[PDB]
Symmetry: D2
Subunit: 191 residues, 4 copies
């Protein structure tokens, strides 16, 4: 079993590796993609539609929340509903963001034909430049981590955190870019 | 603690009461509101934002699903997130639909000032014409039921079906109004 | 185009068909399945896990909501997350309810192996007795509709209502079966 | 803004977020970290997590990851909770409330039901004098000293600090409970 010191040591390692993942973001992201993503979102006259499965889905919901907080309308597209009609939420003026670590997640690949038919901008958020999501995207948004803290290297905790951080930076940058105001914030944050 | 026939008799009563609730819709809804709702949604160049609490929130999700299915973009607005920033999803060209049986649900009333500031069209779905939602709505969409099948008269099962059915009709009508095609349906229903 | 009376007639026909679908529930459902479901849920010491796609997913959320309202803990299992880890919510003492009209929805068939490994009770809510969901279910819960109100016979509006109505009756019956009180309701309905 | 101004803004945000996670040992409680691991390992019910807005997304992250390690978990939506969904919470469960300031009204409304039901309350907040911190069975402190947004309002670093805190708890649980690849494989079959 695990005593107090073993628990805390284990915990300290997970934190070190998660901080490392974020601090290393310039080494795993694309400067061009970061700039193009900021400009494209600032200029968007529609909404941001974000899809992901499991932990990528949670990251997706984080993007959706924070984009709405800065007056960039955004919605979560649930893949199991998307292919049964909720793809109707996606429109021509929108930006579809697909979050998949490996870039070949079947549930998201099923959404690409509709995106192409509708004319939406596709932003592929993945570690794999050879994946369908990276290749089909209008903006390939590379993001990855060199080390995952879980004993199997299967939970994708640092990966998830790296995606959230990437978009946190985009969203914080947009507040300056679009001259976002406290007045606008108060309208949508009354409590 | 109750026999087969007691279970079946209890069940049949609920279905009869729910069937009655749906069949009475022409009596509890407004003809003007039905037509104005069809027209306004058909003409909408933005999206449909729907909010509700508890069972009303499940009704809202049904509207959201079915509107998207007919190429009327729609999103559910979670009241506990809405007032903490997700109200940014609501824009001028949108239609905000608030579903509240009583019409004074505080969690939804908190969304009205932002709706008014943004200039969105407000559809108020409620039984109470004297409610804040009814009074503040651009389209007051009355819907009600005369008997809930549960023993407390509190579960709101019939009320919810009446709301869902009300919009199922609007949505089915929209498919003919807008000349919605099987080609459009196939793009957004490719399957797994 | 369509004038006012054309709009009203179209609307009226949809309600006539939906009400008929509900009134016909005794002839499209199984008396043995209805009784077995009430009894199994009343005896459940775990929670109810309900999954569905698109319109069937909204029906699933209605069940989840109304079960919780009568002190039957329930959770919605999103199929696009389920196969990426959220099947961990499902345990031995639980009841899994799969809602699928045709009963062969791939996103749900992918959840059956885990249900079998886990030892949970499976309730299959479908119109097709020859479907995988029907055949694999511990309780096959037939439900169907003869006529759908939409012009394509593809929206499944009446089918969704029939499914919701079926469980509303199960839930209402459970209030009496289990001697549910307004005191218990008041605790979980302070709003 | 030119290319370099964008990149400088972005890099500053990542620096502050990395710092927020690196400082977790100073802003968390060792006693709470250990008690939370032990309590969750011992839990025979499920983990119910509630939050509003960004705290809600953090709650959903906890819920996903707990499920991934065979610790059943469910998100409790505050606008549904007080309208019947509080019935999901049972005596053998652990309620986790995530609120930065610790006084979010939507969550405070959930505490009386938690006390009546006898569940374990974990209060995740920066504020030790808040209701959530004072009412909790385990007060789980988490805070950040620098928020990267120009208004000090988006709570991006705060959210990340909360997620990272429970990521560590969860990763620690895999070893603590002897979680296997075989268990992982059952609940991660994929979409194919």
């Amino acid at each position: 079993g695990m005593d107090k010191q073993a628990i805390l040591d284990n915990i300290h390692q997970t934190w070190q590796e998660e901080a490392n993942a974020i601090s290393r973001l310039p080494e795993v992201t694309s400067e061009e993609a970061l700039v193009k993503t900021v400009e494209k979102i600032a200029e968007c006259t529609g909404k941001i539609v974000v899809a992901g499965c499991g932990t990528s889905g949670v990251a997706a919901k984080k993007l959706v929340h924070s984009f709405n907080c800065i007056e960039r309308p955004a919605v979560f597209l649930t893949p199991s509903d998307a292919v049964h009609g909720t793809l109707g939420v996606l429109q021509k003026e929108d930006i579809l963001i697909l979050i998949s670590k490996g870039g070949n997640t079947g549930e998201l690949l099923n959404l690409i034909p509709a995106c192409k038919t509708k004319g939406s901008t596709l932003i592929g958020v993945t570690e794999n430049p050879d994946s369908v999501i990276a290749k089909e995207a209008d903006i390939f948004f590379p993001v990855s981590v060199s080390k995952e803290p879980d004993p199997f290297n299967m939970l994708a905790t640092a990966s998830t955190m790296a995606v959230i951080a990437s978009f946190d930076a985009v969203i914080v940058c947009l507040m300056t870019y679009m001259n976002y105001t406290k007045e606008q914030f108060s309208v949508i944050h009354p409590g």
